[PDB]
């Protein structure tokens, strides 16, 4: 403990306690006896005209009458205050380096897991989807630790997480990429685009030392951007050796035929050309671990080639259907019916993806936006943009002001199921073409192909020419009969 | 100023608040009214201070307390000196100044002595 005495103790009895009798004017023994002082000073009368400029003023360097014999204090250096304030304004983050990276690491860790479980709820793909995804990143982590020391090139990127989920899904081979991406954007199924979730509140603050803040969808994918990292992850992963049948899916073909001019025959046509020179009669697999940092026209992005065969098939098939199985007036009817139209969720989604306002292929639909499409758009904004967010501080005043403002314009709401489903729309346009049974048709064919180029290209990293660069590639591949 | 009693109660006040006072640092203060010489009118006064001004001062004198539209006032005194001299009193920067009244007369308007 501290001691007593920093003023007085009763030298009579050894009782080191002190009483104050303010009525007496006396400092006395708390336990025992006597007068600790008869003298008592400063409780002035009725005479303080205050002429005294009394410039002095206490400032704790001349001590004090000590009128508390009660004490404990401590040795002081001289006004903690600055050290006190330094300590109050300390708990923040002020980190950086390996430590910051570990939590940057951690946060990345968590959001992916949150991503995966919505994955299960949406797809109901049992322990299986969950555990494969976990070891996939366990494998990813393995590599990160090795080149540690102070290496802080963890790639990841807003893209890396979905590449991870993508590769894991392919191992399992549940779906597709474009479909997955459009679905995800449309329903914000992924926690992908905003990184505020986590349960970081704190990770947010850990002055995620430059790292973390870089979290949060930062932006939407360009041309490559996303197929490139998948390759990096595979090289990171050595994924092809580890997992079976990657990039495959007779389901992407189905998705694609139904996508539009779904021809109860073009599935087998394109499946056949794929059969053909499409990797020698074999389901093309996940490209490799493009180890090199330059990431060139890998192009063996299997799907990228699937869409290419898809397109090719259509015009080849349709611009030498000698037997005339596909009528002149039939081709434009399909492209016809195609013109825009609502979407039991899908087309509305593709509008939401179009609105990344990229290379201006959908920008104008931006403009046009077929009436309601306009309406169900604002509907999806009032539901799925709300998370939007929650000024912290800056007046519990402006927060209030903001609230008031919102209240003011209160916005929202100052046979049913109109937006029919997907296979409903699909049915009704193949019916809209159900009347089935020279220069112009060539033009029509080109017209139609540009459209699909729009569609397939729009879900994906496009390259208003890589696409065709891609196209060009297999064109060349083909003529070695 | 213009609140009806009901509104005044709705504003946490004594339904009859007369006002007229000032809340300064929370303490209600009003300015005490003062009785001063009636403005703008010459009041004939005999005062021994006038003798206290110096030699040749009589008791007699006139005091008019002129107040401007803005209500600031300026007191003007005439003294009859025992010698017949008339002096004009005024105050500026709270200092007193004496001038012969015939000076302020010839100064106000161009005139003859016979005027």
């Amino acid at each position: 403990m501290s001691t007593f005495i920093r003023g007085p103790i009763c030298g009579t009895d050894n009782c080191p306690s002190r009483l104050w009798r303010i009525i007496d004017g006396r400092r006395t023994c708390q336990y025992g006896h006597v007068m600790e002082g008869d003298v008592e000073f400063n409780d002035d009368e009725d005479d303080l005209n205050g002429l005294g400029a009394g410039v002095i003023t206490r400032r704790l360097n001349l001590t004090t009458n000590a009128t508390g014999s009660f004490q404990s204090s401590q040795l002081t250096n001289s006004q903690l205050l600055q050290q006190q304030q330094r300590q109050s304004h300390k708990k923040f983050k002020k980190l950086i380096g390996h430590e910051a990276k570990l939590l940057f690491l951690k946060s990345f860790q968590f959001i992916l897991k949150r991503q995966i479980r919505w994955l299960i709820t949406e797809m109901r793909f049992p322990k299986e989807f969950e555990h494969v995804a976990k070891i996939i990143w366990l494998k990813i982590l393995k590599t990160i630790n090795d080149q540690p020391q102070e290496e802080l090139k963890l790639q990841l990127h807003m893209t890396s997480t979905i590449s991870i989920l993508y590769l894991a899904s392919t191992h399992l081979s549940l779906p597709v990429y474009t479909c997955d991406y459009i679905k995800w954007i449309c329903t914000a199924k992924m926690p992908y685009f905003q990184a505020s979730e986590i349960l970081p509140k704190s990770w947010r603050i850990q002055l995620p030392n430059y790292y973390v803040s870089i979290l949060e969808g930062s932006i939407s994918p360009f041309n490559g951007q996303l197929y490139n990292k998948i390759a990096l992850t595979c090289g990171m992963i050595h994924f092809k050796e580890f997992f079976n049948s990657e990039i495959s899916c007779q389901g992407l073909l189905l998705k694609l035929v139904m996508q539009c001019a779904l021809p109860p025959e073009f599935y087998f046509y394109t499946k056949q050309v794929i059969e053909f020179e499409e990797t020698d009669i074999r389901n093309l697999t996940l490209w490799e671990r493009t180890d090199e940092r330059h990431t060139g026209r890998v192009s063996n992005h299997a799907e990228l080639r699937v869409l290419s065969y898809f397109m090719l098939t259509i015009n080849w098939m349709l611009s030498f259907d000698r037997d005339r199985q596909y009528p002149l007036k039939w081709i434009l009817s399909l492209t016809e019916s195609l013109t825009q139209r609502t979407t039991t969720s899908e087309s509305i989604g593709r509008n939401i993806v179009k609105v990344v306002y990229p290379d201006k292929p959908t920008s104008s639909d931006y403009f046009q936006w077929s009436e309601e499409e306009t309406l169900e758009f604002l509907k999806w904004m009032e539901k799925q943009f709300l998370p939007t967010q929650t000024s912290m501080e800056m007046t519990i005043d402006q927060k209030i002001a903001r609230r008031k403002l919102y209240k003011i314009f209160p916005l929202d709401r100052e046979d049913s199921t109109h937006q029919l489903t997907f296979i409903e729309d699909l049915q009704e346009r193949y019916a809209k073409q159900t009347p089935f049974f020279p220069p112009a048709r060539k033009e029509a064919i080109g017209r139609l192909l540009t459209h699909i180029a729009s569609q397939l290209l729009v879900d994906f990293a496009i390259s208003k020419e890589q696409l065709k660069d891609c196209i060009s590639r297999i064109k060349n591949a083909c003529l070695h009969r | 100023n213009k609140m009806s009693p009901y509104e005044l109660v709705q504003h946490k006040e004594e339904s009859d608040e007369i006002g007229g006072y000032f809340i300064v640092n929370g303490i209600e203060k009003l300015i005490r009214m003062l009785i001063v010489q009636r403005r703008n009118h010459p009041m004939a006064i005999i005062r021994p201070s006038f003798a206290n001004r110096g030699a040749s001062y009589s008791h007699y004198g006139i005091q008019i307390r002129s107040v401007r539209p803005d209500q600031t006032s300026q007191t003007n005194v005439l003294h009859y000196l025992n010698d017949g001299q008339v002096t004009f009193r005024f105050s500026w920067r709270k200092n007193e100044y004496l001038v012969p009244v015939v000076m302020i007369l010839k100064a106000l308007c161009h005139t003859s002595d016979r005027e």
Binding site: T395 | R68, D70, Q71
Partner: protein, 52 residues
């Protein structure tokens, strides 16, 4: 009101930068008329966290 008549009667307070200009000097180095035109009083208001 009384206060605005008062400010109309106080008039001006003139100051010369000390004539300089190098008659420049003697005939003042420009006049610097100053004054108070109007006086307004507003009902008590309080804005917190300052502006905004």
């Amino acid at each position: 009101g009384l206060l605005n008549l008062g400010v109309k009667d106080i008039g001006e307070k003139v100051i010369f930068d000390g004539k300089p200009l190098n008659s420049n000097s003697g005939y003042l180095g420009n006049k610097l008329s100053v004054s108070v035109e109007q006086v307004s009083i507003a009902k008590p208001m309080s804005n917190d966290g300052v502006s905004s």
